[PDB]
Paper text:
Unliganded TRs recruit a multiprotein complex which contains corepressor (CoR; e.g., nuclear receptor corepressor [NCoR] or silencing mediator of retinoic acid and thyroid hormone receptor [SMRT]) and histone deacetylase (HDAC) to inhibit target gene transcription. Receptor occupancy by a ligand (T3) promotes the dissociation of this corepressor complex with the relief of transcriptional repression and mediates the recruitment of a protein complex containing coactivators (e.g., NCoA-1/SRC-1, NCoA-2/GRIP-1, and NCoA-3/ACTR) with chromatin-remodeling activity, inducing the transcription of target genes.
Accordingly, to model the human TRα mutants, we crystallized an artificial mutant receptor (P393GX) which was truncated at the carboxy terminus of helix 11. Importantly, the P393GX TRα shows similar molecular behavior to the human TRα mutants. Interestingly, the lack of the carboxy-terminal end of helix 11 and the joining of the loop to helix 12 creates space for residues amino-terminal to helix 3 to form a short anti-parallel β-sheet, which is not present in the wild-type receptor.
Residue numbers in the entry: 156 to 391
């Protein structure tokens, strides 16, 4: 009834799923290696910042210590998608700076653990809503957790997530792009493959596809609130 990946789109999906899996911290068995950020950390948000806000700085350090590798992995992922590597250097850097939080956020959210109400950062650090609120995301902490809980139910697989990530990456909605039309063709290709792959999985949920497109908007929201700290160093 509802259409299902063409053979060129099965190819796209292999490449994208392998790019995601090869850059997802600790891989598919991440859950068996975790350290819970300890209780005494992230509880006291007392230090002002050059931006005006108060932050439990110890916590902010513990987070800042593991963020660069996480960024690196987003870049590794991007560079493994051929439609992304064909872009000019100038546009690659824009696009990366632009989705890097959208993607790290999604990457944590699908590793939401209802058993302990924690997010899992880079496959190892289990954190509570309040630790990451006080560590420097404000309300953004609350937004990712709501999303975590929301996705438990959708039960996404590494392909769905991979493809979701490519749709985030090839956004045409960024200041400064040269090759806008190429990016939109590629976004459209990924969207259409993704819609098809979702067909191919009979999801025991009504309206799965459109419900899931809505979480794109939530992720672009996250990325818009926490966009400052990405004048990151992209090396192509
Ligand atoms: N867990 C993801 C990676 C990931 C890593 C970290 I550190 C995260 O927290 C942030 C991000 C920006 C900030 O300014 C602060 I303060 C904390 C998140 I949300 C995600 C993965 O699987 O790659």
């Amino acid at each position: 009834q509802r259409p299902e990946p063409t053979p060129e789109e099965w190819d796209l999906i292999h490449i994208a799923t392998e790019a995601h899996r090869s850059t997802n911290a600790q891989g598919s068995h991440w859950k068996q290696r975790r350290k819970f950020l300890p209780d005494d950390i992230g509880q006291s948000p007392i230090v002002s910042m050059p931006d005006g806000d108060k932050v439990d700085l110890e916590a902010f350090s513990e987070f800042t210590k593991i963020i660069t590798p996480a960024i690196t992995r987003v870049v590794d992922f991007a560079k493994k998608l051929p439609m992304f590597s064909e872009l000019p250097c100038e546009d690659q850097i824009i696009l990366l700076k632009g989705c890097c939080m959208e993607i790290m956020s999604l990457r944590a959210a699908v590793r939401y653990d209802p058993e302990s109400d924690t997010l899992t950062l880079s496959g190892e650090m289990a954190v509570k809503r309040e630790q990451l609120k006080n560590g420097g995301l404000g309300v953004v902490s609350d937004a990712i957790f709501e999303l975590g809980k929301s996705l438990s139910a959708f039960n996404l697989d590494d392909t769905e997530v991979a493809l979701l990530q490519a749709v985030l990456l090839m956004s045409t909605d960024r200041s400064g792009l040269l090759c806008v039309d190429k990016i939109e063709k590629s976004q459209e290709a990924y969207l259409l493959a993704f819609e098809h792959y979702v067909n191919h999985r009979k999801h025991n949920i009504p309206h799965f596809w459109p419900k899931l497109l809505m979480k794109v908007t939530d992720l672009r929201m996250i990325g818009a609130c926490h966009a400052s700290r990405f004048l990151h160093m992209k090396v192509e």
